[PDB]
UniProtKB/Swiss-Prot annotation:
Function: Could play a role in the pathogenesis of H.pylori by serving as an inflammatory mediator.
Subcellular location(s) of the protein: Cell outer membrane
Domain of life: Bacteria
Name listed for the protein in its UniProt record: LPP20 lipoprotein
Membrane-protein topology: Lipid-anchor
A GO cellular component annotation in the UniProt record: cell outer membrane
UniProt keyword annotations, A-Z: Cell outer membrane, Lipoprotein, Membrane, Palmitate, Signal
Length: 114
């Protein structure tokens, strides 16, 4: 059946050895016009938007050590580097998993003073 990442708790799946080097994001897109390619591209873009959103909130939480709108801009600048990791096609929708190297995330915290 479907891989663990499609329906699983992403905070738990991120602990797998396979994903130890990446920050994850996931999204789905309903197939219309029988075009799986279109929903694959849409789900990939939404998967990157999901990765960016969860990375921002994680970096805000880390600020328990102006801030808000400036992690927002520094993660959005790095999002170009994220990779498609996997695709799973369900009954009527496409799921996509993307990842961003943690070293790239390590660099972003330094710009913040972490």
């Amino acid at each position: 059946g479907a891989p663990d990442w499609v329906v699983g708790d992403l905070e738990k799946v991120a602990k797998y050895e396979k994903y130890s080097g990446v920050f994850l994001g996931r999204a789905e897109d309903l197939i219309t016009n029988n075009d799986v390619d279109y929903s694959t591209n849409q789900a990939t873009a939404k998967a990157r938007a999901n990765l960016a959103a969860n990375l921002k909130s994680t970096l805000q939480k880390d600020l328990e050590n102006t801030d808000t709108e400036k992690i927002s801009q520094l993660v959005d600048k790095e999002l170009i580097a994220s990779k498609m990791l996997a695709r799973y096609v369900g009954k009527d929708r496409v799921f996509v998993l993307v990842g961003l190297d943690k070293q790239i995330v390590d660099k972003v915290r330094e710009e913040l003073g972490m």
